[PDB]
Amino acid sequence: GEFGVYLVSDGSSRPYRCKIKAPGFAHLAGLDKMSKGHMLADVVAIIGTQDIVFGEVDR
Amino acid sequence: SMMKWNRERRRLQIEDFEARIALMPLFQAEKDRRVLQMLRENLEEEAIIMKDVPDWKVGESVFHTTRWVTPMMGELYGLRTNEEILSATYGFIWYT
C-alpha cells in the first residue's frame, strides 16, 4: 500500500524520532468492517487480501 | 447397447429358470421321500424312549385335523447332531 516514513531530524548525525506509515496498520484496523457479514471461513480470506504481513503492521 | 444386453440376460434367466422347472419333479420326489422317512425315524425313536412314560401313546396328532401338516423343523431335526441342526437351520443363512 502506501508505506511512508515520517522522521524528525534534530540536526545531529542521528535521527530523533521516526514514524513509519504502515499500509497494513490501517488495513488491519479496517479488518473489523470487512468481516461483518461474513463467515470465519471468509475471515481467513479477508486476512489474506489485507496483505497483513505482521512485522509491517507491528512496526 | 445396454437394452440389448439386458434383453439377452432375460432370455438367459428364463432359460435358467426353465431348467429348474424341469428339475422340480425329481427334486420334489426326493425331498418328499427324505422328509417323511426322516420323520419315521423320529417316530421309531419315539417308540423306544416313551415306553416308560405314564401317558405317552406314540404318534399323537398335535393338530386336531387329519389333514397333513408340513412338518415343523423342530420335530424333524430335533433328535440329530449339532452339525445337522446348524447346517440345516442357518446353513443357507450363513453361507458368506
Binding site: - | 432375460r10 432370455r11 434367466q13 428364463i14 429358470f17 426353465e18 422347472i21 422340480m24
Partner: protein, 83 residues
Amino acid sequence: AGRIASFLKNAWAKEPVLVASFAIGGLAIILPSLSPYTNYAIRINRATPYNYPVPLRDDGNMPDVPSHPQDPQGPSLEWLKNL
C-alpha cells in the same frame, strides 16, 4: 410467447441446474406413457416362470393347453427372442 421464451432462456442464464433437472424429470414421466415398449416390458416380466406351472387336470375339451411341452398349443414367446 415472448415472456415464456425470455423467461426460459433467462432462467437458463442464472441457473442451468434445476432447468436441466426439471427437463429430465419432465421427460421421465411423459414418455413412459408414450413408449411402445412398456407393454413389451410387462409381457416379458410376466413371461418369467418363477413358480412351477402346475399341470391342469385333463378331462377333455381344453384344446388350448398342450399335452406336452413341445406341442404348438399353449402360450408361445417367439416374439421374445426376437425382442
